[PDB]
């Protein structure tokens, strides 16, 4: 998208692996507020918006 109209995907009914996000060597900024990336795998979330 563009910032004025920000695209949103509602991700649901799935098993999500977050190791791929953390193990990635490319992201410039991976700032997590309220949760920490390494411990994200442990929990299950009702809904995730992207």
């Amino acid at each position: 998208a563009s910032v004025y109209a920000w695209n949103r995907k509602r991700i649901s009914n799935c098993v999500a692996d977050y190791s791929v996000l953390y193990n990635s060597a490319s992201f410039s900024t991976f700032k997590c507020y309220g949760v920490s990336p390494t411990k994200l795998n442990d929990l299950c979330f009702t809904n995730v918006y992207a």
Partner: protein, 49 residues
């Protein structure tokens, strides 16, 4: 109500315990009142605050 003098003490203590237990449901500024979720989401450098 004839035994109110004892019941109020029981009620005050029950209330005192009920208030104390209810304080565990308060965040006090934290992201969550339940300790296990904070430790499950955050790492020590963030969890400690």
């Amino acid at each position: 109500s004839a035994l109110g003098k004892l019941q109020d003490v029981v009620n005050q203590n029950a209330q005192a315990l009920n208030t104390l237990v209810k304080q565990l449901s308060s965040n006090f500024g934290a992201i969550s009142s339940v300790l296990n979720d904070i430790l499950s989401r955050l790492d020590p450098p963030e969890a400690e605050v």
